[PDB]
Amino acid sequence: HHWGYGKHNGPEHWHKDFPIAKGERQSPVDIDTHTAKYDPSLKPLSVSYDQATSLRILNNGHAFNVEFDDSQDKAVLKGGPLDGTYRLIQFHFHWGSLDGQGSEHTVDKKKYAAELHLVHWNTKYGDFGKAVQQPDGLAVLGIFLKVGSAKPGLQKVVDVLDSIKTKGKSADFTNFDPRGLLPESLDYWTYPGSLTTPPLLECVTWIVLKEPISVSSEQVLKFRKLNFNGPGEPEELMVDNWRPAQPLKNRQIKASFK
Numbered sequence: 001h002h003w004g005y006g007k008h009n010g011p012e013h014w015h016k017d018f019p020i021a022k023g024e025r026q027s028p029v030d031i032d033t034h035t036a037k038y039d040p041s042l043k044p045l046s047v048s049y050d051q052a053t054s055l056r057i058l059n060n061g062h063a064f065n066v067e068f069d070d071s072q073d074k075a076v077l078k079g080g081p082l083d084g085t086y087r088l089i090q091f092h093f094h095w096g097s098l099d100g101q102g103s104e105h106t107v108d109k110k111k112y113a114a115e116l117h118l119v120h121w122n123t124k125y126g127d128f129g130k131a132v133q134q135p136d137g138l139a140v141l142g143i144f145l146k147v148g149s150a151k152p153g154l155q156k157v158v159d160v161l162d163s164i165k166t167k168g169k170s171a172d173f174t175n176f177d178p179r180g181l182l183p184e185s186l187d188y189w190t191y192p193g194s195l196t197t198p199p200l201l202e203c204v205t206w207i208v209l210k211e212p213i214s215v216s217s218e219q220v221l222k223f224r225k226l227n228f229n230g231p232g233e234p235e236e237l238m239v240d241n242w243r244p245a246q247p248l249k250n251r252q253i254k255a256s257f258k
């Protein structure tokens with residue numbers, strides 16, 4: 001009876017195994033755009049993905065992760081609210097059972113169809129495992145997905161999902177360029193938060209882009225064909241793998257833009 005997104009093991013249950021679920025800097029949150037304060041001391045985001053090396057795509061039973069070689073400074077996030085350099089280790093998505101829900105962060109209570117998380121760790125802590133134990137260990141770039149025109153740079157991901165239907169299944173996934181998943185603008189909101197899955201560690205600087213990307217209905221429909229379950233188990237569709245907004249408590253969301 002391990003955590004998930006079902007009736008009996010979903011987000012409202014997680015605190016029993018992970019008491020930090022009720023902590024002081026939990027994610028996601030609702031972004032109240034009118035209360036977010038423009039911070040002119042914030043710097044432009046620096047996304048340097050030209051040398052990114054993807055390796056694998058994995059169904060881990062709660063999402064699929066596109067994994068990168070993070071043994072060198074190849075794909076890095078810096079600037080913005082960040083001090084130092086953060087290395088890309090994986091990205092994944094959260095999505096809904098239909099287009100009206102799926103995102104984790106909300107914007108003035110608006111839910112998007114899905115949300116992309118590009119996960120980076122602070123190089124001053126040596127690796128990901130040590131980074132998640134630090135309050136400034138991770139930087140996660142969050143990008144909203146709405147349904148409309150297709151995202152061409154997403155299609156290579158969509159087309160491999162048939163090969164990782166069930167949890168624990170992986171597939172080779174080299175030469176994928178995550179620049180193809182970015183919107184035009186890098187305007188963002190930022191706040192201190194947590195992992196949105198157990199262990200829910202409070203180690204993340206969140207950077208949420210204001211501009212969503214558009215993906216096609218066909219593209220998100222293929223996300224929804226994945227399975228939470230393992231091979232030869234009863235089929236449960238991997239849908240609604242999002243945590244709802246958590247209390248903001250003593251935090252301020254800052255905007256990079258007016």
Ligand SMILES: [Zn+2]
Pocket residue numbers: 092093094117196
């Ligand atoms: Zn996530």
